[PDB]
From a paper:
The Fc region of IgG antibodies (Cγ2 and Cγ3 domains) is responsible for effector functions such as antibody-dependent cell-mediated cytotoxicity and phagocytosis, through engagement with Fcγ receptors, although the ability to elicit these functions differs between the four human IgG subclasses. The IgG4 subclass binds certain Fcγ receptors with lower affinity than IgG1 and IgG3, and does not activate complement. The Cγ2 domain FG loop (residues 325–331) plays a crucial role in the interaction with Fcγ receptors, in which Pro329 from the FG loop forms a hydrophobic “proline sandwich” interaction with two tryptophan residues from the receptor, and is also involved in the interaction between IgG1/3 and C1q. While the conformation of the Cγ2 domain FG loop is conserved in IgG1, high resolution cryogenic crystal structures of IgG4-Fc revealed a different, unique conformation for the Cγ2 FG loop, which would disrupt the interaction with Fcγ receptors.
The asymmetric unit of the room temperature (RT) recombinant human IgG4-Fc crystal structure solved from crystals in situ contains one Fc molecule, comprising two chains (A and B). A heptasaccharide core, covalently linked to Asn297 in the Cγ2 domain, was modelled for each chain. The RT structure belongs to the same crystal form (space group P 21 21 21) previously reported for the cryogenic recombinant IgG4-Fc crystal structure, and the overall domain topology is comparable. However, the Cγ2 domains adopt a slightly more “open” conformation at room temperature i.e. they are further apart from one another compared with their position in the cryogenic structure. Despite belonging to the same crystal form, the b and c unit cell dimensions in the RT structure (b = 81.93 Å, c = 103.88 Å) are ∼3 Å and 6 Å longer, respectively, than those in the cryogenic recombinant IgG4-Fc structure (b = 78.97 Å, c = 97.88 Å). In this chain, the two loop conformations are associated with substantial changes in crystal packing interactions at the two different temperatures. However, our structure also demonstrates that when either conformation is accessible, the Cγ2 FG loop from the other chain (chain A) does not sample multiple conformations, and adopts the unique, IgG4-like conformation at near-physiological temperature.
Numbering used by the authors:
A (entry chain A): 236 to 444
B (entry chain B): 237 to 444
């Protein structure tokens, strides 16, 4: 047999906001009962760190255990492409497993944000679609949000990023609103957060006029 | 050990009786040590034998790639019959089994809306023509663009997204030169779905 190790990147919104906390997560599955206490070693560009909180064994229904270690990272380091390494080993055993992760390499490209009002044919329905097109960005790590008059909006869905011909990404975010709120003149805003934007943030408004 | 993958027929093939839909079972990572691979097809439990098998293929990583294709009936797929692929090989200690069928559920008609480019995009050399297709089920769908009867090629489509009402939506973006849009050419977004009358609909989009 043998345990498996998976490494997960922080959330884009966490890396692009100084006030939030980005976390790299290392997950070990298929740990047997009589396996020694799993130990973790974290490395940032080869340099070992020690500010990683490790969680206890979590029994799964397939009679294996699950162990999770979480490392807090600096926004500056992750956005500069530093390499994070998770070294998993049992206490005593010489076998060791390593996994690494880092940001996508490549030239960051600034996204272009366009807002599209609902089609004239959709006005007959009870609810209209507000469309936010975000194209031409790299890497694909991005966060899109909707809001109106300050408060966040709730009923929106965002497509996965699609790789475009020029090597950049684009996606669409669709906010569904009641037609009444669109005709009453309310202002809706599409917030985009990407590392290639000024202050990692831009915003485009959309209202009936 | 090797791995097996099972693919559904193309949505365009299942929505036109003039075309032929086929389920595709692909066996990859077969080692040259053992080239013998056996297929067994089942349609709602009943085994069939009318499926063909493409001969082996080389790979840049010193592996093989054998394919088996079963032709299905349009009514059989749209009714939800399960299709099973049982791959037997010496490289597999027990035969791998893969099943597939159309998503069960009440079909829902797609709404298609064409959206012209944003005013802010007119400052670029190319503009974006957007086709919103929402409220459809199942996710099997085909979206194409054409201008003045001839098909367009420079478009990309997002994968279907599960909306909160249990239906799917997607966007298709046709990229055209700003000149062509400004000259008044008519572009059409074609959508093919089983819940549509004649399985086909198209919405146009022009400057005036
Ligand atoms: C015993 O059970 C455990 C627990 O499973 C749970 O319990 C059982 C009983 C069932 O009920 C399960 O349904 C239930 O989930 C089993 O543990 C599982 O083990 C498998 C592998 O054997 C793992 O699969 C991997 O999954 C990752 C993604 O995992 C995320 O998303 C899952 C849902 O989609 C979610 O369940 C996971 O917890 C995890 O969630 C993430 O968590 C972090 C932090 O917690 C969070 O920040 C994230 O937001 C969150 N994400 C989401 C979406 O929620 C998947 O990525 C792996 O695929 C990679 O590796 C494959 C090789 O193993 C490879 O084939 C793939 O192509 C892919 O390869 C990667 O590709 C990327 C490209 O993008 C590349 O960059 C990478 O380098 C490359 N890596 C490699 C190695 O190739 C993989 O599929 C399960 O996650 C894991 N579940 C849990 C809960 O831990 C255990 O296997 C069982 N044991 C036995 C013997 O049966
Ligand atoms: C050696 O090389 C070969 C060949 O690779 C080729 O050559 C090398 C030299 C490189 O240049 C490669 O870049 C090049 O591709 C390798 O064979 C590959 O093996 C991998 C697996 O390791 C396969 O990946 C899977 O791909 C499927 C989708 O496959 C289609 O799309 C591919 C492009 O995306 C395309 O290349 C394929 O040919 C195939 O195309 C289809 O062809 C049929 C034929 O008629 C056609 O009808 C279809 O229309 C057409 N489709 C398209 C889209 O074009 C992908 O879906 C798989 O992901 C699932 O499986 C993972 C592993 O199980 C799992 O971790 C994922 O999470 C995911 O899980 C699935 O998720 C869906 C939805 O979420 C769910 O419904 C499923 O149930 C679920 N399944 C499971 C099991 O969980 C997977 O990524 C490659 O396709 C395959 N390449 C070819 C050409 O077959 C070989 O691996 C190499 N070996 C070594 C040792 O290196």
């Amino acid at each position: 047999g043998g345990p498996s190790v998976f490494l997960f990147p922080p959330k884009p919104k966490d890396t692009l906001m100084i006030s939030r906390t980005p976390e790299v997560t290392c997950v070990v599955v298929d740990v047997s009962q009589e396996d020694p206490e799993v130990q973790f070693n974290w490395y940032v560009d080869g340099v070992e760190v020690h500010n990683a909180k490790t969680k206890p064994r979590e029994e799964q229904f397939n009679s294996t255990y699950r162990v999770v270690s979480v490392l807090t990272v600096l926004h500056q380091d992750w956005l500069n492409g530093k390499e994070y390494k998770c070294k998993v080993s049992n206490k005593g055993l010489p076998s060791s497993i390593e996994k690494t992760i880092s940001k996508a390499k490549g030239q960051p490209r600034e996204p272009q944000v366009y807002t599209l009002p609902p089609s004239q044919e959709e006005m007959t329905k009870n609810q209209v679609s507000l469309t936010c097109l975000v194209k031409g960005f790299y890497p694909s790590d991005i966060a899109v949000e909707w809001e109106s008059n300050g408060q966040p909006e709730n009923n929106y869905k965002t497509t996965p990023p699609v790789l475009d011909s020029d090597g950049s990404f684009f996606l669409y975010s669709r906010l569904t609103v009641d037609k009444s709120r669109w005709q009453e003149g309310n202002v809706f805003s599409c917030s985009v957060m990407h590392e290639a934007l000024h202050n990692h943030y831009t915003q485009k408004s959309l209202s009936l006029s």
